[PDB]
Design a binder for this molecule. Structure first.
Ligand SMILES: C[C@H](Cn1cnc2c(N)ncnc21)OC[P@](=O)(S)OP(=O)(O)OP(=O)(O)O
Ligand SMILES: C[C@H](Cn1cnc2c(N)ncnc21)OC[P@](=O)(S)OP(=O)(O)OP(=O)(O)O
Ligand SMILES: C[C@H](Cn1cnc2c(N)ncnc21)OC[P@](=O)(S)OP(=O)(O)OP(=O)(O)O
Ligand SMILES: C[C@H](Cn1cnc2c(N)ncnc21)OC[P@](=O)(S)OP(=O)(O)OP(=O)(O)O
Ligand SMILES: C[C@H](Cn1cnc2c(N)ncnc21)OC[P@](=O)(S)OP(=O)(O)OP(=O)(O)O
Ligand SMILES: C[C@H](Cn1cnc2c(N)ncnc21)OC[P@](=O)(S)OP(=O)(O)OP(=O)(O)O
Lengths: 151, 151, 151, 151, 151, 151
């Protein structure tokens, strides 16, 4: 279906430390997106390096890897129609200072390096990120569509 | 006045079923718009066709008419300066996935067919919609202006 | 059955004027109680005296009648298991200053005469109050059983 | 330490289905309790029976084991001073209708069978429940004491 | 009248450092209590000792003085009927773990030493505390009574 | 250096009277901006004219001066990276009706004359406004950077 689209979201160590996990989950739940995977973990260097592989050649890659592996991360997978692009709109933009009020980064962030949450940029990136962070057993298979949310 | 402008708003069956009525009323109350009419009802095919008349030649007309009659609707009328255009901005856009975080559809909707709330598109549409859903007795006549909201 | 119990609730002129209608409705909706009746109206002296009949010989009767008729009131009917005793608990006690934080009066009221909301004191009072404020046509007959709320 | 006390909390299938996971996590985070374990899973009949082992001879045991395995559950472990007793106070009482406004069950529940969340009744039950639902690797070891929350 | 009663409230350094100032102020404003004095300051040892004078011979006195001077404090004065006792009820009890959900300490605190906010225990203590923290010029004199909050 | 930027914000008499002080302070605190100055006062014509000096020859100058002196104002100073531009984004635009939902004016305002809060338009205007409303003693000097908010 088109309503079975999935995105990977990570509440970064700064979002976890600031106690924003519930606030964030509650925003995606109110939207109508279904939580199909959820876990708290301290990421390994390998998970971090494979996750941010598009920034591997840039000077700040080291710091990104160090910071995401510096403390607990809440990894989640949400399912819904256009969940990839929608989840991103809900987060805001790279710079939290330029992110609109009402968005996660707009409401809670001030620094690019401490930008609370990260989401998949595309359906291809999502499917790769989901497989990396989660095992098939850790993901829901039975997802009954809400007739209140979908026509 | 100007500040006596009125708009018609309908919390659709999906918005009532999902328990979003108070959430929605609170947003317009916080804004400074005065509730001049309020009721819960199951709309008739008669009322629905008349309400959705601007789309009577479109292929989706029947579907809009079927859905708005499928369960209880919370019908309301708000009064304030630029309430028609403002109420619409507060709702978001046709596609809830494209609606900005901070708006009703932006925060709670995923599908065009399940887009929670509908509002008048113009002052002319509002005056027609208000007369169609409400009787003069069901509307407030005495509206004292709040000196904290109006200069 | 027992989950089909109904209570009458009135957001008094002070609760309406202060813009607390959406806040209050959202509280009962969150709880799992179903809205089966809703309307805004300016009560007549006849409706006000009939409503406050149990206190018709008390010195404060006139004052209660004068205030409930002084502006718009939001009249509602909620359905659920033990809704009568549960709505009262959610409201708090007669004196809002003695009402616990978390209740409507505890969170928003300071005066007995400006105590925002009133609810039915018993199933008997509820059935009488509902018939007095609402016509059978104004009340839902089809109430969808929620399997997440009720075992 | 005393501040290193841990409790096991489960958002039951009804709490997950109603989209209350984030609302719940936010409440414990706002309090100052640290999340040390988190996961979503559909529990097996075995894990449910071992979890509800204290009631294995009671007539309602079967019903509790059937319901907790009927859909996804969000399993969590929180750390803090008096977290076992405090989480329970935050949840409310067995009957959500008797639970005080401000508590989780007092704000969102109407039925004993659909009472959203369950928490450990003691430190001994917590240590057993934590070991039963989580592997030592799934739980945090490094827990930074907040000098704003602890003297 | 008796609606002119005043209380002194202090958001302690832990309260301020955790970013609970606006949350706390919103609660008293929603209640109907009028803010008649407000300031942020780092208290001097002299002001701290004078404030905590009733406990000057207790073993914990030193610790209370050390902590209230360790960082910024948001000092405020609220006016309204029974504001002294009501403000205390809103705060909760000495131990935040024993404080009811819905109270400031019940919702946000875990430790007696980090109990976010302090309020006057009596009208006599309030009048003394107000004079100690505020100059007559720093306090409002013109307080128009809200007819929506007082009969 | 860059994270030490400061802005001046004034919750205008309309914002104070509508009890919005707590809501506003919370928004800036959630964001990660540090409150370095805070006070409630009734501004003098001298302070008002100096504050609104950039518009001293515009026809609306008198109206702005009259209104900001008509009741209590909550003056505050926030510190953070890009706080001047970010605080304006959080306020919205001049016309609250055109302000996006999620912004303060977008969420609570209807009139240009009653637009709840004013903020510095530039770093130069901020430094001037801060020195005008606050004495150096009234401002924090020791501001430890939060490692959860800054890289
Ligand atoms: C490129 C970004 C931001 N970033 C971190 N440090 C720096 C830095 N020093 N210079 C520039 N950019 C930086 O890193 C990943 P993230 O924060 S998950 O995501 P996003 O939502 O921004 O998005 P996408 O476009 O990666 O999906
Ligand atoms: C024409 C629209 C949208 N729409 C619903 N289904 C479809 C569909 N199948 N194809 C196209 N458009 C669709 O219907 C009305 P509504 O949802 S109250 O919203 P609006 O706020 O956009 O309204 P207005 O702009 O007319 O006020
Ligand atoms: C007798 C009560 C209390 N009361 C109101 N004004 C006064 C007054 N001036 N002197 C004394 N008592 C007063 O009046 C009804 P109400 O306010 S709808 O509701 P309740 O929910 O508290 O209760 P119940 O009456 O339905 O049990
Ligand atoms: C025995 C308890 C209570 N209870 C639930 N259904 C029934 C029922 N049908 N008959 C009797 N008792 C019942 O079951 C677990 P729970 O629902 S998580 O609740 P709790 O958090 O209140 O309790 P505890 O186990 O920590 O005390
Ligand atoms: C003596 C009391 C209690 N107390 C604080 N720390 C300690 C401590 N370490 N050991 C014992 N007792 C302590 O101190 C004041 P506070 O904390 S504002 O609270 P309150 O609500 O009790 O009120 P009041 O005293 O203003 O009435
Ligand atoms: C010039 C503005 C707006 N303004 C008020 N009345 C009028 C009026 N009658 N005609 C035009 N403009 C008016 O005055 C300041 P303020 O209201 S704090 O707004 P802002 O914070 O959006 O401001 P800035 O600092 O960016 O200007």
């Amino acid at each position: 279906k088109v309503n079975k689209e999935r995105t990977f979201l990570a509440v970064k160590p700064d979002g976890v430390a600031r106690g924003l996990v519930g606030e964030i989950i509650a925003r995606y739940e109110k939207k109508g997106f279904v939580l199909v995977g959820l876990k708290q973990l301290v990421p390994t260097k390998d998970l971090a390096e494979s996750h941010y592989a598009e920034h591997k050649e840039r000077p700040f890659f080291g710091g990104l890897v160090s910071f995401i592996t510096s403390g607990p991360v809440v990894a989640m997978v949400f399912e819904g129609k256009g969940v990839v692009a929608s989840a991103r709109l809900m987060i805001g933009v790279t710079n939290p200072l330029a992110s609109a009020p009402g968005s996660i980064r707009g409401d809670f962030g001030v620094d690019v390096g401490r930008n609370i949450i990260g989401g998949s940029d595309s359906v291809e990136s999502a499917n790769r990120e989901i497989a990396l962070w989660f095992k098939p057993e850790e993901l829901l298979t039975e997802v009954k569509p809400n007739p209140n949310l979908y026509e």
